[PDB]
Amino acid sequence: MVSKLSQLQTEMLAALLESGLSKEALIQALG
Amino acid sequence: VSKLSQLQTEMLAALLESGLSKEALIQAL
């Protein structure tokens, strides 16, 4: 729980996976 | 474009631009 930005990033990634975005598509975009 | 796909896309670009570490990505996966 380092920073407001890190907490928000964490929530966003979780939300995306919940919405149906694959893990592979996440990796493609952000890896 | 579908509104859902577009929102996901825009969230991804914002994440990328915000400086998401390689470790943070691994942790979320």
Side-chain angles (χ1 to χ4, degrees), chain A residues 2-31, chain B residues 1-28:
Chain A
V2 12
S3 73
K4 295 168 182 182
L5 178 60
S6 69
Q7 178 183 331
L8 174 56
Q9 290 167 329
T10 299
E11 295 283 10
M12 295 176 64
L13 294 160
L16 285 169
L17 291 169
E18 171 178 58
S19 75
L21 190 83
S22 74
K23 296 192 176 196
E24 170 176 6
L26 221 64
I27 292 166
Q28 115 235 294
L30 308 176
Chain B
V1 64
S2 77
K3 297 303 202 192
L4 171 65
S5 174
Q6 177 173 62
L7 178 59
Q8 290 168 326
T9 298
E10 297 186 332
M11 291 178 189
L12 290 168
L15 277 162
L16 178 68
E17 297 166 3
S18 72
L20 183 68
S21 76
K22 317 67 194 144
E23 286 163 25
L25 174 60
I26 287 164
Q27 196 56 16

